[PDB]
Amino acid sequence: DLGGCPFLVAENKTGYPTIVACKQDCNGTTETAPNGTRCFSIGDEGLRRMTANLPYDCPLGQCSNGDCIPKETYEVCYRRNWRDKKNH
Ligand SMILES: *[C@@H]1O[C@H](CO)[C@@H](O)[C@H](O)[C@H]1NC(C)=O
Ligand SMILES: *[C@@H]1O[C@H](CO)[C@@H](O)[C@H](O)[C@H]1NC(C)=O
């Protein structure tokens, strides 16, 4: 019974995933990533609103107590759908 499910990610030009929020809904189950996990602080809708295959500078951060805390560095990043095809 229940629960949990994987976090969404963006990748760099080569496909290395970095998650994009530190919390998730799983239907009504909430997950929180461990304090310290790499993440981009852009959010699930931040991810959805990104044009498939185009590059964004995504602000890097580290997770703490469920929020991606930015670290003022930035890194070049990507939303890739199945078969690279176009968003939404
Ligand atoms: C993305 O990251 C991984 C490890 O952090 C690395 O081996 C790879 O070359 C990276 N891709 C680019 C284009 O920077
Ligand atoms: C993670 O870090 C925060 C604040 O730095 C702390 O208050 C919190 O209890 C920590 N949680 C765990 C399980 O490490």
Residue numbers in the entry: 8 to 95
Sentences from the paper on this structure:
Anti-chemokine activity has been described in the extracts of tick salivary glands, and we have recently described the cloning and characterization of such chemokine binding proteins from a tick salivary gland cDNA library, which we have named Evasins.
Crystals of the glycosylated tick chemokine binding protein produced in Sf9 insect cells using the baculovirus expression system were obtained as described in the Methods section. The structure was solved by molecular replacement using the previously determined structure of the non-glycosylated form of Evasin-1. The unit cell contains 3 molecules per asymmetric unit: monomer A (Asp8-His95), monomer B (Gly11-Trp89) and monomer C (Asp8-Trp89). Monomer A had the lowest overall B-factor (53.9A3) compared to the other two monomers, had the largest stretch of visible amino acids (8 to 95), and will thus be used as the reference glycosylated structure in the discussion below. Residue Asn19 was the only one of the three predicted glycosylation sites, which displayed clear electron density for a sugar moiety. Only one saccharide unit, built as an N-acetyl D-glucosamine, could be successfully modelled into all three monomers of Evasin1-glycosylated on residue Asn19. Asn19 is at the C-terminal end of the 1st β-strand (β1) and is well exposed to solvent.
